[PDB]
Design a protein around this ligand. Sequence first.
Ligand SMILES: O=C(CCCCCCC(=O)Nc1c[nH]c(=O)[nH]c1=O)NO
Length: 193
Amino acid sequence: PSNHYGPIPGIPVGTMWRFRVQVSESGVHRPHVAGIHGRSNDGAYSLVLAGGYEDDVDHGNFFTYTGSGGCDQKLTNTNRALALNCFAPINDQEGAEAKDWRSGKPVRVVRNVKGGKNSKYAPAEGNRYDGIYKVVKYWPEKGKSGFLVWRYLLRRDDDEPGPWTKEGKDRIKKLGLTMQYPEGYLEALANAH
Ligand SMILES: O=C(CCCCCCC(=O)Nc1c[nH]c(=O)[nH]c1=O)NO
């Protein structure tokens, strides 16, 4: 259903879609605009990396991430959902750290092209599912705007190899994974002259 944790059965690491709407219908990331999917009384099930905040670093197996809202950010809505994934008691004043971070709730992570400029791992086209990550720690700090922002550190915890790795490339080749286009899209662009 909508609140399903973990990988979508039948959708392996390395699957690519050209548009966010295809990512929504696959179930990997259900919101078609919002960069994160979750519930404040539950966890976060998926998020997309598409640039956003320049202080975020993306290094493949680990990356930093900045929350949403709002003025100061609050540990509400999806900010709390992502925090609740961290294997630590929720703390909206100083953040928390999971000593046993692999026991936290999984997050499906897709990256989008517009994150390209401060991430060498963003795909050149469309969206790519990169596997399960886990919330290592989260903390509040003063952002570039001068207000408060909630930051997160996540790390990869997936049985399938990262798609950029040699072994992940072999799986993409062996599975036949290719850029998915909506039916008729390429045909409509070519007849438009
Ligand atoms: O870069 C990667 C992929 C390869 C890391 C896999 C094994 C290394 C590791 O297990 N080290 C750990 C250190 N400290 C912890 O607390 N827990 C750990 O599990 N990370 O996802």
